[PDB]
RNA sequence: UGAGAAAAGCCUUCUCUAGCGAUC
């Protein structure tokens, strides 16, 4: 007589999020011994997913939002209006450092969103905590600087100087000067492999294992100057743009690109892919912004013609896309629930003091870092960052003992170079041809005068 | 870290989600509960542990249970008790077990656990809790008493409670409290069986099973008070009056030569015409007392009989008092009465306006104890009320009798009488003799009354001469200097220089410890019309250095209280 | 291996209960921490009775 | 970073961020820089390549 | 306009005291934890390597017999007591915890071919080539007296 | 030995023990 008899139900959609079994296949099994194992496999998967569905209540934060009223357009809303209507905590995160004596700046946030490091064209190198306004180090290397990146924790950062590649501590003391990596223009770090991928002006892509200190691969792209590069965090492959209009997929194991994708009628100047690995964003000389579907189809989902050129691109963790055109930035936002960004009308606009030279989103905050000739600015972007973070993976609020314990766990785990492929789950599949080769060996052990002719 | 905490929160999730399904609690309430539960969980999983954290956790869970219980009745939903209520109860039981394991020595935590088990837990859990308590805390008979009490009044099991009592006696063979409660317990068992027969073995129904305890307990504990104590519980039970009769008869025969037994027989006999009816009862009780006197002539027996007569007097009055003198004279002649009871009768007589018997008690006391000065004071108060002209004789006799020099109340009393009915020169003569006799700390009160007399008998000039002589006899008090300053204020002159001169002397003696004296000095410079308030800067500076320890803090607070209007 | 031990002390008598122990390798470098470390000792041994003098 | 435990050291042997002898030869190169104060790292390399060129000619002759 | 930005309360995310331990929120989102197959494979491979490092089966060796061991019998009630029988005819009782020999008896002449322990554990049975079946007492003989079946 | 040698103040990286925690 109790009005509701059953136990508490869980939403189907959240359960489907924690599922890794291909229900699509209709594989036949006519043996009971196979049947018992398969039913257990579904039972183990079903039980584990359900517990995670209930655990959604543990999540405590909510993503930001920004809507106009009475038909206001969000494009014309400026940063000054936002700072006044937002609390003192987030208002302190917006600041504009003005350093015009040195050249245009390239900025990189750490994987943990607490630290920021930047490098100047004329030779200014500095790393700082940006939440609190403290300066970790400030040095001036005599040569020009083309790129800067963090290596895993904030301790080490690699600077792409004029001649070779250099390694510095967080306190400014020089450690390594790698002469093999020469005239490199772009740098990017693979976190879970401890591989640093370098693109050089001479046309070579080089991989370095920062854990052991050995160069695993040095590949000749065979396309001339290399200036456009990005990685897919889900896929771990490297994308390389060329003046031909093609983007090449690379892995350290192969000596030839995994695939070539023709994206533009002219030269490509930017490439960026989302965290989930579903979409790619590219821009080129034909002033077209394109969104590509990386789940097997490789068709351009969205297209738009622009007055100026999108020099740089980036994605947040919620799916927002920002394009840096001249001295103006524009952010496109969409619902993102299994849909690409909608390029119909931009979400926010802002005009910088100088031309844009670098864009990147903070990992777990609603701010955007823009590097330009005038200096470095921090915008406020409501709805861009992921609200809830995992404590054992990336804590902004972590002590030293938490950090040094975490690093060894990642080092005990390090992925070999050759396992990088287009499918991150390719290790699950059985190698079909070796099955056939093995079966070959298994088989091996187991009228009247016409006759006179 | 939060591995165990996360396990516990995911264990706590299903009942919260069911509560959401009920409609009892809204989703925001569930979020707040999860937040506070995580905050409290982080407290009790640390490497450093405190009892306050366990108590806070238990209190939060109890408050949540009460809130749920209140809301269910309003909603009217009574299903799914097991999913929520029992889950919370097991979690609280685990917390209590861990806390009790950490702190075995704390009985108060054990009693909190017992109370929670009574309120919310199954009776078998409470049985296990009592067993665990009695395992390590067997040396406290009160715990055995509570454990046995729970069996009878709650579980209604008389036999199980008997074994808990019987085992308790082997651990504590000499505790009288265990015997009395066990004696009471069996008589309770008799009442249950008597009502049992009415609703529908003969020997137990008579109370024989309790009578066995009485004989054995008397043998182990050979005391008069204990045997009388067992009777008190026996009278409380109406049934089996023979049991009360049997024990009462044994009181006289077995217990003799002790005053308490004879007294109890007397008070039992105690238990306008009705006033006469009271009268013969008092005589019958008295006759018992003399029968005890010839059998037992010890001193202790007498006082119970004088105190009996004293109580009847204070509570017709003439007949009661006529008893008092006759028993007083009889006790006095055998000299057994002690000093203290002489005073008690004497003061009672004074309050009832009877001034001829009080003299007899006073005179009788002095001849027995000539050295005792307190009864000498008692005699003096009698003659003052009597107004007899023998006051002068009394002081001469007392001081000759009092060989020790220190008789402080006598010295004061002589000063009081001499002022009333003697010349002023003799009063000064008495005071000067007193200051010679007493040289130590007792002179403090002597000097204060000397100065007060000087202002009354003389004027301001006379007080000045007395103050000048005594300003060097070092044992002092602050009342000596407060009196002198007060006399200066009342005079019309109010020489402000003399005001400072007295305060400096007072601050020289008691400045190290007296915060109030420094405060009073500062207000004089302000409020007095002749004062110089520009000295207040220096007095505060001087006050800080001489004051030591806690007095330094009090002066600061009082002055800060003085700057505000609260004073 | 559940067994009871009687320990006699100047303050009184104590009765204790043993839950589990690795008997064979007890006198070994790694296993000896079972009794030495206070936390691990509390895991395997409890105080069930105490009667002081 | 932290001092590695006994079981950790076996699996994380040859892992050292600070010393990479095979790839850049920094430790041996440092001693030359300090012993004779060389302002720029380029100055040492131009010396090193040139010395090799002299050595090649002597071997070939 | 309606605006909100993510604003964490520091007291939620930071411990209160030096005595307290750091609080760690956990998110089980698959997007935050990629590479689930390759990451777990390395942990499994490292697990097998560790097992090979710590594989140390040998514990101790007991000596004292003067001829080859032929029979063994474990004691039902106590883990630490075993019995052995050698070719010379002697039977030795061993204390496993102390790694020494408690008693040595000359049970038979010639080989001993079998030893078994009575289920209660106060006696054992031995058989030798002298065509005899002998029962003995598990408890050691008192003081210095010689043992008898 | 040869980032010459000698002294004071600020950050960074790490090492040892000793309690503490595991009793539900």
Strand partners, E128: E112
CA-based nearest residue to B251, from B274, B271, B229, B269 = B229
Cβ-based contacts of A142 with chain D (< 8 Å): 40
Place of tokens 């999860």: B34
Half-sphere exposure of A266 (CA within 13 A, CB side): 10
Q: What are the structure tokens assigned to D46, written together?
A: 């131009």
Looking from the CA of E59 toward its CB, the CA atoms found within 13 Å total: 12
For residue C8, the surrounding DSSP H or E stretch is strand C3-8
Sequence-ordered strand ranges (E) for B318-462? none
B408: three-class secondary structure by DSSP: helix
Residue A337, judged by CB atoms within 10 A of its CB (0-12, 13-18, 19+), counts as: exposed
Q: What angle do CA A228, A232, A236 make, to 5 degrees?
A: 110
Rounded distance between C-alpha atoms, residue B169 and residue B178, angstroms: 7
CA angle B448, B452, B453 (to 5 degrees): 115
Q: What is the DSSP string of B179-205?
A: HHHHHHHHHHHHHHHHHHHHH--HHHH
Using an 8 Å Cβ cutoff, are A42 and A23 in contact? no
Q: How far apart are CA A392 and CA E33, in angstroms?
A: 10
Across the interface, of E4, E24, E28, the residue whose CB is closest to A64 is E4
In this structure, are residues A111 and A363 in contact, taking their beta carbons and an 8 Å threshold? yes
Residues of A in contact with D40 (CB under 8 A): 142
Strand order in the sheet with A246-250: A228-231, A238-241, A246-250, A259-262
Alpha-carbon gap, residue B551 to C5, rounded angstroms: 59
> Tokens 């504009």 label which residue?
A96
- How far, in Å, CA of B105 to CA of A263, rounded? 78
What are B227's two structure tokens?
A: 């045997």
Q: Helix or strand or coil: residue B475? A: coil
**Interatomic CA distance for residues E97 and E82, integer angstroms:** 11
Contacts of residue C15, defined as CB under 8 A and 6 or more positions apart, other chains included, come to C4, C5, C6, C7, C47, C48, C49, C50
Chain B residues with CB under 8 Å of E24 CB are 1-2
Structure tokens at E61: 């060796």
Write phi, then psi, for B305 (nearest 5 degrees): -90, -35
Report whether C44 contacts C50 (CB < 8 A): no
The single residue listed with the structure tokens 């350290």 is: A252
- Asked if C21 and C44 touch (Cβ cutoff 8 Å), the reply is yes
Beta-bridge mates of residue A176: A167
Contact C49 B104 (CB under 8 A): no
- Asked if B2 and B46 count as a contact pair (C-beta separation under 8 A), the reply is no
Give the H or E element holding residue C16: strand C12-18
Close Cβ partners of B114 (under 8 Å, ≥ 6 residues apart): B126, B129, B130, B133, B146
Chain E contact present for D15, CB below 8 A: no
Q: At what angle do helices B224-236 and B241-254 cross, to 10 degrees?
A: 160
Interface test with E, best of C1, C2, C20, C23 (most E CBs within 10 A): C23
Nearest residue by alpha-carbon distance to C1' of F2: D35
Contacts 24+ apart (CB under 8 A), A428-433: A428/E37
The subunits that touch chain D, with at least 3 C-beta pairs less than 8 Å apart, are A, E
Angle at which helix B424-437 crosses helix B408-421, to 10 degrees, equals 170
Instruction: Answer for the pair A376, A106: CB distance below 8 angstroms, yes or no.
Output: no
DSSP state of C6: E
Beta-carbon separation of A81 and E26 below 8 A: no
- A137 CA – F10 C1', rounded, Å: 14
E46–D7 C-beta distance less than 8 A: no
Which CA-bearing residue is nearest the C1' of F1? D35
Beta bridge partners of B359: none
Chain B contacts in chain A segment 20-39 (CB below 8 A) = none
Query: What CA–CA distance (Å, rounded) separates B182 from B169?
Result: 10
CA neighbor of B214 nearest in space, from B199, B198, B231: B231
Two structure tokens written together for B126 = 């409470």
Residue B171 and residue B149: Cα distance in Å, rounded?
A: 18
Sheet holding C45-52, edge to edge: C3-8, C12-18, C45-52
CB A208 within 8 A of CB A190: no
Q: Report CA(A169)–C1'(F10) in Å, whole number.
A: 19
**Would you say how long chain D is, in residues?**
61
> Do A315 and A304 contact (CB within 8 A), yes or no?
no
Give residue A105's Cα distance to chain centre. Answer: 21
The residue with tokens 């989302």 is A274
From the CB of residue C1, how many other CB atoms can be counted at a distance below 10 Å?
A: 10
| A135, β-bridge pairs | A128
- The burial class, CB within 10 Å (0-12 / 13-18 / 19+), for B197 is exposed
**Tokens 């430790």 found at:** D27
Question: Which experiment gave this structure?
Answer: cryo-EM
CB-based contact, E61 to chain A, within 8 Å: no
Spell out the residues 6+ positions from residue B516 whose beta carbon is closer than 8 angstroms to its own: B558
- Neighbour order of strands in the sheet with A164-169: A145-151, A156-161, A164-169, A174-182
> Which residue is the nearest neighbor of F15, CA to C1'?
D3
Q: Quick one: DSSP state of residue B533?
A: G
- DSSP result, chain E: -EEE-----HHHHS-SSSSSPPP------TTTS--HHHHHHHHHHHHHHHHHHS-----------SS-EEEEEE-SS-TTEEEEEETTSEEEEEETTTTEEEEEEE--SS-EEEEEE-TTSSEEEEEETTS-EEEEESSPPSTTPPP--
Judged on CB neighbours under 10 Å (0-12, 13-18, 19+), B442 is middle
Residue B371 φ then ψ, to 5°: -75, -30
Q: Which nucleotide is nearest to B91 (CA to C1')?
A: F24
Q: 10 Å Cβ neighbour count for E26?
A: 18
> d(Cα A95, Cα A109) in Å, to the nearest integer?
15
CA distances from B236 to B184, B241, B483, C48, E67 (A): 10, 10, 63, 41, 88
Helix (H) or strand (E) holding C50: strand C45-52
Judged by C1' against the alpha carbon of B47, the nearest nucleotide is F21
Kindly determine whether residue B42 and residue E20, on different chains, have CB atoms separated by under 8 Å.
Answer: yes
Those residues whose C-beta lies under 8 Å from the C-beta of residue C30, and which sit 6 or more positions away, are none
Q: What is the 3-state secondary structure (H, E, C) of chain A?
A: CCCCCCCCCCCHHHHHHCCCCCCCCCCCCCCHHHHHHHHHHHHHHHHHHHHHHHHHHHCCCCCCEEECCCCCCCCCCCHHHHHHHCCHHHHCCCCEEECCCCCCEEEEECCCCCEEEEEECCCEEEEEECCCCEEEEEEECCCCEEEEEEECCCCEEEEEECCEEEEEECCCCEEEEEEEEECEEEEEEECCCCEEEEEECCCEEEEEECCCCEEEEEEECCCCCCCEEEECCCCCCEEEECCCCEEEEECCCCCCCCEEEECCCCCEEEEEECCCCCEEEEEECCCEEEEEECCCCCCEEEEEECCCCCCEEEECCCCCEEEEECCEEEEECCCCCCCCCCCCCCCEEEECCCCEEEEEECCCCCEEEEEECCEEEEEECCCCCCCCCCCCCCCCCCCHHHHHHHHHHHHHHCCCCCCCCCCCCCCCCCCHHHHHHHHHHHHHHCCHHHCCC
C1' (F9) to CA (A172) span, angstroms: 21
- B46:E21 CB<8 A: yes
Nearest to A54 by CA among B22, B32, E32, B14: B14
Q: Quick one: which H or E segment has residue B420?
A: helix B408-421
Residue C47, helix vs strand vs coil: strand
**Residue bearing tokens 């010295």:** B411
Kind of pairing between the strands at C45-52 and C12-18: antiparallel
The two tokens of residue B88 are 């919370």
Which residue's CA shows the smallest distance to C1' of F13? D1
DSSP 8-state assignment for residue B85: I
* Number of neighbouring beta carbons within 10 Å of residue E78: 14
DSSP B83: I
Do residues B25 and B18 make contact, with C-beta atoms less than 8 angstroms apart?
no
Which residues in B219-368 belong to E strands, given as ranges?
A: none
Task: Output the six-digit token pair for B164.
Answer: 């808990």
CB within 8 Å: E98 and C27: yes
Give me the sheet containing A115-120, strands edge to edge. A105-109, A115-120, A124-129, A134-140
A339, A301 contact by CB (below 8 A): no
Phi, psi for A174 (deg, rounded to 5):
-75, 135
> Using an 8 Å Cβ cutoff, are B502 and B539 in contact?
no
Distance, in angstroms, between A17 CA and closest chain E CA?
A: 8
| Rounded Cα distance, E115 and E134, in Å | 10
Q: What DSSP line would sit under B493-532, residue for residue? A: S--HHHHHHHHHHHHHHHTTT-HHHHHHHHHHHHHSTT--
Enter the resolution in angstroms.
Answer: 3.9
CA B94/CA B76 separation, integer angstroms: 30
Q: Residue B30: enclosing H or E segment and its boundaries? A: helix B27-44
Evaluate whether B417 touches B409 at the Cβ level (below 8 Å): no
- Helix axis angle, B550-563 relative to B515-527, nearest 10°? 30
A with E: how many residue pairs have Cβ under 8 Å apart? 113
DSSP state of D16: -
Query: Which nucleotides of chain F are near protein (any atom < 7 Å from a CB)?
Result: 2-3, 11-16, 19-24
**A60·B17 Cβ contact <8 A:** no
Nearest to D22 among A175, A179, A214 (CB): A214
């Amino acid at each position: 007589q109790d009005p509701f008899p059953g136990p508490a139900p869980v939403p189907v959609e959240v359960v489907q999020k924690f599922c890794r079994i291909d229900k699509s296949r209709k594989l036949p099994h006519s043996k009971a011994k196979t049947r018992s194992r398969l039913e257990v496999a579904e039972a183990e998967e079903e039980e584990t997913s359900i517990k995670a569905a209930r655990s959604e209540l543990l999540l405590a934060e909510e993503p930001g939002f920004l809507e106009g009223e009475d038909g206001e357009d969000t494009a014309k809303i400026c940063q000054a209006d936002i700072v006044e209507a937002v609390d003192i905590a987030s208002a302190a995160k917006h600041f504009d450092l003005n350093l015009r004596q040195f050249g245009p700046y390239r900025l990189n946030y750490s994987r943990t969103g607490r630290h920021l490091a930047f490098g100047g064209r004329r030779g200014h190198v500095a790393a700082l905590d940006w939440v609190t306004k403290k300066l970790m180090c400030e040095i001036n290397v005599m040569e020009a600087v083309r790129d800067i990146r963090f290596l895993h924790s904030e301790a080490l950062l690699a600077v792409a100087q004029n001649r070779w590649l250099h390694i510095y501590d967080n306190q400014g003391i020089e450690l390594h000067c790698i002469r093999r990596c020469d005239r490199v223009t772009r740098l990017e770090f693979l976190p879970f492999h401890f591989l640093l991928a370098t693109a050089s002006e001479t046309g070579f892509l080089t991989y370095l294992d920062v854990s052991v200190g050995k160069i695993v691969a040095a590949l000749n792209a065979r396309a001339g100057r290399l200036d456009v590069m990005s990685q897919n965090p889900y896929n771990a492959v490297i994308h390389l743009g060329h003046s031909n209009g093609t983007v090449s997929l690379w892995s350290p194991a192969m000596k030839e690109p995994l695939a070539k994708i023709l994206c533009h009628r002219g030269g490509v100047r930017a490439v960026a892919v989302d965290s989930t690995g579903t979409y790619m964003a590219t821009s080129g000389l034909d002033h077209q912004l394109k969104i590509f579907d990386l789940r097997g189809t490789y068709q351009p989902l969205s297209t738009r013609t622009l007055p100026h050129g999108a020099g740089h691109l980036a994605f947040s963790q919620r799916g927002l896309l920002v394009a840096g055109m001249g001295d103006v930035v524009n952010i496109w936002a969409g619902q993102g629930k299994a849909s690409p960004p909608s390029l119909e009308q931009p979400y926010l606009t802002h005009r910088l003091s100088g031309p844009v030279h670098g864009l990147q989103f903070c990992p777990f905050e609603d701010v955007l870092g823009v590097g330009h000739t005038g200096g470095i600015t921090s915008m406020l972007v409501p709805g861009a960052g992921e609200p809830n973070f995992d404590g054992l993976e990336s804590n902004p609020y972590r002590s030293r003992k938490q950090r040094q314990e975490w690093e060894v766990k990642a080092l005990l785990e390090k992925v070999p170079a050759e396992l990088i492929c287009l499918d991150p789950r390719a290790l699950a599949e059985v190698d079909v041809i070796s099955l056939e080769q093995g079966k070959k060996e298994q088989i091996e052990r187991l009228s009247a005068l016409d006759r006179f002719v | 870290m939060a591995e165990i905490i996360q396990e516990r929160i995911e264990d706590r999730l299903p009942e919260l989600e069911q509560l959401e399904r009920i409609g009892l609690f809204s989703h925001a309430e569930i979020k707040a509960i999860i937040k506070k539960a995580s905050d409290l969980e982080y407290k009790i999983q640390r490497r450093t542990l405190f009892k306050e954290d366990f108590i806070n956790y238990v209190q939060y869970e109890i408050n949540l249970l009460e809130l749920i219980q209140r809301r269910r009745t309003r909603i009217g939903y009574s299903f799914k008790k097991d999913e929520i209520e029992n889950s919370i109860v097991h979690r609280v039981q685990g917390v209590f077990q861990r806390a009790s394991a950490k702190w075995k020595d704390d009985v108060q935590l054990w009693l909190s656990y017992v109370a929670f088990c009574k309120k919310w837990a199954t009776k078998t859990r409470l049985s296990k809790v009592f067993s665990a308590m009695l395992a390590i805390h067997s040396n406290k008979p009160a715990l055995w008493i509570m454990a046995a009490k729970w069996e009878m009044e709650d579980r209604l099991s008389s036999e199980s409670a008997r074994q808990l009592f019987l085992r308790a006696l082997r651990f504590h063979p000499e505790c009288p409290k265990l015997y009395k409660e066990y004696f009471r317990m069996e008589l309770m068992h008799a009442e249950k069986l008597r009502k049992e027969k009415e609703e529908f073995s003969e020997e137990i129904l008579k109370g024989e099973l309790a009578w066995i305890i009485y004989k054995n307990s008397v043998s182990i504990i050979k005391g008069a008070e204990f045997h009388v104590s067992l009777l008190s519980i026996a009278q409380l039970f109406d049934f089996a009056k023979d049991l009360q009769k049997e024990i009462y008869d044994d009181l006289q025969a077995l217990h003799t030569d002790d005053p308490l037994t004879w007294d109890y027989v007397a008070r039992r006999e105690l238990e306008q015409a009705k006033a006469v009816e009271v009268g013969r009862k008092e005589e019958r009780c008295c006759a018992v007392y003399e029968e005890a006197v010839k059998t037992l002539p010890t001193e202790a027996m007498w006082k119970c009989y004088i105190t009996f007569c004293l109580e009847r007097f204070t509570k017709l009055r003439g007949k009661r008092l006529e008893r008092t003198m006759t028993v007083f004279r009889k006790a006095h002649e055998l000299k057994l009465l002690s000093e203290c009871q002489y005073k008690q009768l004497s003061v009672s007589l004074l309050c009832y306006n009877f001034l001829r018997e009080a003299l007899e008690v006073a005179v009788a006391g002095t001849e027995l104890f000539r050295d005792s000065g307190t009864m000498w004071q008692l005699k003096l108060q009698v003659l003052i009320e009597s107004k007899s002209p023998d006051i002068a004789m009394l002081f001469e006799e007392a001081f000759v009798h009092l060989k020790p020099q220190v008789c402080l109340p006598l010295w004061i009393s002589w000063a009081e009488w001499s002022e009333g009915a003697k010349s002023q020169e003799d009063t000064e003569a008495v005071f000067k003799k007193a200051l010679l006799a007493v040289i130590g700390a007792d002179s403090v009160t002597l000097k204060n009354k000397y100065l007060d007399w000087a202002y009354r008998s003389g004027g301001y000039k006379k007080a000045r001469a007395v103050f000048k002589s005594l300003q060097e006899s070092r044992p002092f008090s602050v009342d000596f200097f407060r009196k002198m300053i007060q006399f200066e204020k009342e005079q019309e002159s109010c020489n402000m220089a003399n005001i400072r001169e007295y305060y400096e002397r007072a601050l020289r003696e008691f400045g190290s410890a007296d915060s109030d004296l420094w405060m009073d000095y500062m207000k004089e410079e302000l409020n007095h019309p002749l004062g110089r308030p520009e000295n207040c800067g220096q007095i505060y500076w001087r006050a800080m250095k001489m004051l030591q320890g806690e007095s330094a803090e009090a002066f600061v607070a009082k002055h800060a209280m003085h700057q505000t209007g609260h004073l | 291996v559940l067994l009871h031990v009687l320990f006699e002390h100047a303050v009184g008598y104590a009765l204790l209960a043993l839950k589990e122990v690795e008997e064979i390798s007890l006198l070994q470098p790694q296993v000896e921490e079972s009794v030495l470390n206070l936390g691990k000792f509390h895991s395997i041994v409890r105080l069930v009775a105490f009667c002081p003098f | 970073v932290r001092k590695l435990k006994f079981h950790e050291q076996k699996l994380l042997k040859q892992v050292d961020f600070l010393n990479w002898e095979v790839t850049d030869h920094n430790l041996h190169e440092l001693r030359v820089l300090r012993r004779y104060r060389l302002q720029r790292r380029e100055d040492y390399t131009r010396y090193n390549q040139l010395s090799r060129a002299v050595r090649e000619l002597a071997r070939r002759l | 306009m309606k605006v909100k930005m993510l604003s964490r309360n520091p007291d939620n995310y930071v411990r209160e005291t030096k005595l307290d331990l750091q609080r760690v929120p956990r998110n089980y989102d698959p997007a935050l934890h990629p590479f689930e197959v390759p990451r777990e494979y390395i942990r499994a491979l490292n697990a097998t390597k560790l097992e090979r490092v710590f594989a140390k089966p040998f514990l101790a060796s007991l000596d004292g017999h003067r001829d080859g061991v032929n029979c063994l019998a474990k004691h039902p009630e106590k883990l630490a007591t075993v019995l052995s029988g050698a070719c010379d005819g002697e039977v030795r009782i061993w204390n496993l915890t102390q790694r020494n020999c408690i008693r040595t008896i000359q049970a038979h002449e010639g080989f001993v071919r079998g030893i078994c322990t009575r289920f209660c554990g106060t006696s054992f049975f031995t058989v030798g080539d002298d065509k005899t079946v002998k029962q003995w007492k598990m408890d050691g003989p008192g003081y210095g007296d010689e043992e008898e079946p």
